Design a protein around this nucleic acid. Structure first.
Length: 179
RNA sequence: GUCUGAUCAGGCAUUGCCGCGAAGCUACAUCCGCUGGAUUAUGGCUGAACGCCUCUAAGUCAGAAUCCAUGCUAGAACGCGG
């Protein structure tokens, strides 16, 4: 089938082959968007329209999602999402520095479990990670994208997953709060 | 023990006669030794198939000795080539 997605006043959508751009005051975000047959390069003024002729189970998947991610990219570049995690610790005081001053496209977790060491991961695109107010448990991501924003949830969770000691007993772990 | 005439001074000979070191070599001994790339279980990330949902169909990431290259020898098919 075919679907329609509009664009408001202070946003400019521009799909140009599979390469998409959505423009907003936070940033301008690129991903790709094109499956088998389906042509999303049909800009009818405001309405960007996905259209395909064929159907089928796995085929209808890439009809909806290319429609969805342009609505999600406008919410990302305009408003900004907030994906939610928390630093948890058992006894030892888990210490964090953020992507400002010291962190030059990296975040850090030190004193995870009983580390004298450090478990380090980089960060993705133009994500303005809002850790703390004064001090908080919660770290909360926000950026210009949708994907790259919560990718800094993935970055931070996997690098210090509770592996070498058990997750069940030892409660040093930065788990997800909710999507 | 015997010969060189004898004494004597010198030789053969009995495994290097048998008793004790340093050339020449060595240990029971001396010296030395881990770079980048590709990805899996697994966990997530945006988002489906399928009004909700979730790692995959579009889209997109973190990730294992071994894998793989660093380190040393070599008939362009590898000793290049001035």
């Amino acid at each position: 089938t075919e679907q329609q997605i509009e664009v408001p006043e202070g946003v400019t959508v521009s799909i140009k082959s599979r390469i998409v751009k959505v423009v907003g005051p936070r940033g301008t975000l690129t991903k790709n968007l094109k499956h088998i047959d389906v042509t999303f390069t049909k800009v009818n003024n405001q309405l960007i329209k996905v259209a395909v002729h064929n159907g089928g189970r796995k085929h209808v998947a890439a009809l909806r999602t290319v429609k969805s991610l342009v609505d999600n990219m406008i919410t990302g570049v305009t408003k900004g999402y907030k994906y939610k995690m928390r630093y948890v610790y058992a006894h030892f005081p888990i210490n964090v520095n953020i992507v400002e001053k010291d962190g030059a496209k990296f975040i850090e977790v030190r004193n995870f479990l009983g580390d004298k060491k450090i478990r380090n991961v980089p960060v993705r695109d133009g994500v303005t990670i809002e850790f703390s107010t004064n001090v908080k448990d919660e770290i909360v991501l926000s950026g210009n994208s949708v994907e790259d924003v919560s990718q800094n949830a993935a970055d931070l969770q996997q690098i210090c997953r509770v592996r070498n000691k058990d997750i069940r007993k030892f409660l040093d772990g930065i788990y997800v709060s909710h999507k």
